[PDB]
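hey m, so remember when u said the tokens were messed up on ur end? i reran from scratch. heres the input so u can diff it against urs
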Amino acid sequence: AMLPHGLIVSCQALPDEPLHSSFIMSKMALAAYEGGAVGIRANTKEDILAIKETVDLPVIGIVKRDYDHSDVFITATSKEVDELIESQCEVIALDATLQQRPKETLDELVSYIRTHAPNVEIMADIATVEEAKNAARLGFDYIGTTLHGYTSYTQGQLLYQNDFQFLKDVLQSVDAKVIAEGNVITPDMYKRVMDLGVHCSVVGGAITRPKEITKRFVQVME
């Protein structure tokens, strides 16, 4: 397995966020590497290639792209997969909910990846326990929780709620490698999720989003 136990840093500034920049994301990933991260989440082929220039950490690649008439935006179709194959990231991740996709179904997209990029591992971005089970059924190499609370049917939910109850349920329903992702904001939460038995945790905003860290300081004053 490409991803060792440990901390993954997500370096995925989108257009219109302050640090949107292949170049800046390559230096964020260099910082995460120097601080002891064991991998990187990255978005778009161009950011993946920039990152692969500054670090040798295995990278988890997505392409975030909206399609009309679909709620699936994380590596929705084989178009995004083909970009990621050219990028040579070690792990291709994709929304592995069962919401309607623009083109291939999720089943078909998994088969597509195994067919055309047999050397790459796959990772399932999921929002629910049933989705996690289905991803295990599809043979995903890793199962992440980034979509928990970020779908229309999980509004309100936060990974940490009720002492990480959702994560507990996920770990008990599958035997696949489970990745805690989404609002892991303190070293203490990170410790907690590793204690609960996840393989890795992914941290984004608490490391690579100074706007969001800034807002957390400023709001104690409200």
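this time it looks ok to me. DSSP finds nine helices and eight strands in the chain. if urs says something different then somethings off w ur setup not the seq
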